[model samples]
Target: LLNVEGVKKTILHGGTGELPNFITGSRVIFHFRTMKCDEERTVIDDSRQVGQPMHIIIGNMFKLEFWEILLTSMRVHEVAEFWCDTIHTGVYPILSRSLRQMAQGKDPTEWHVHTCGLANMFAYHTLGYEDLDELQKEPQPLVFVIELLQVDAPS
Candidate 1:
């Protein structure tokens, strides 16, 4: 916790029980806020607002690599905030797009069987719709306030 400075971490409330071992199939449930930097900090995407904490399996890929790094040290029921620079959220915009799309039930819209080269990139979220695109558009740092709700070891 003290070793890192870029994304400074402060535990508003410490978690109980031992931190997870993060086994391949361990389950991680969290409520998250990807919010704006402006004082308003309007949330871009929220696990709570969506009516369920995000369900992620440990060792699985995340739209943002930071999630993996951030969760590794977390304990159950811990609430923490990590203030990160824009680079830390480089892929958030595009990644966020997918979440909202799925939340709205508008995606998995496969216009299957036809795509090539650059076309494929734009045609589908083949390489991520806004991966770094949103960062480029706004170029601002972000605050990731997350609450580690529950953790279960691999069964």
Candidate 2:
């Protein structure tokens, strides 16, 4: 099992109609995986061990009007990737496009988005660890707010 941490939540507001502009609440949940080494190996081999996966939850605030727009456009995956890229630039644009395609015609269920976001994280983490730590820091890399046209949603 991985260590799970519940990080802070943030609200991001904005993007032209070309993109989504609404409040998004996100949290970072951590998990750790341990893999047993082969008996024949005497040395500590990081490569042989399995690592825990980090899951990020980005909630399109239910009360936000733009969420309706998101559902209408059926572009939750695209918007999720846009936010992910904004948080972790290491994310490849091609992966985002792929996810967008995959998300087409799918319902905006919590499990679907959560799984997709984690898969993207794993891919990016495996490719390189260069910006990982910096991106983990609370305010700058992991959490932030964007400003777009602000319209209030009914409570």
Candidate 3:
């Protein structure tokens, strides 16, 4: 149970052993699927389907810091779902674009341009990817179902 503000967690299946220490620099590997909080529950991303697992280093200040809290609350092999409010999910589109591009072997941060003024504004709005641009235009709550696979100690 992550006691953070504007987020809720539900464990679909329990994990083995007690919770991991999740100390600073600890690396967490997991699979995650993100979806909209709408009646249709439109899926946004799935790490498993992409044939890759997500990894995060604790205390590394990932943009979605809210996910750190959720990860720390779980143990290895844990399966859980987290409902994050719009505030926490607002940047998900940006993160998703990075992941999507990385999956396609493209530069994720290519949206930035050396120019300024209106061009910057236009570049910000057009994320190249249509789905992410749609999400960026309208922020909404999201549901993340995570399956914690492993935790590794810092070297």
Best by lDDT: 3
TM-score of 3: 0.83
TM-score of 1: 0.73
Give all TM-scores, in the order shown.
0.73, 0.19, 0.83
Judging by TM-score, tell me the better candidate of 1 and 2: 1
Q: Taking the tens digit of each residue's C-alpha lDDT, what string does model 1 give over 1-155?
A: 64454587778888788777677667888888877678888677777889877766766534424677787668888888887777677677756755665665554454341233236667654544453454546677888888988777777
The list of candidate 2 runs beyond 4 A from truth reads 1-110, 120-148
How much is the lDDT of residue 102 in candidate 1? 61
Kindly indicate the candidate among 2 and 3 with the higher lDDT: 3
- Arrange candidates, best lDDT first: 3, 1, 2
Candidate scoring better on TM-score of 1 and 3: 3
Which tens-of-lDDT digit does each residue in 30-92 have in candidate 3? 999999978899887999899999887887634436678788888889899999899898888
In the order shown, the candidates' Cα RMSDs to the true structure are: 4.8, 16.7, 3.8
Clashing pairs in 1: 94-130
Q: Cα deviation of 114 in candidate 2 (Å)?
A: 1.9
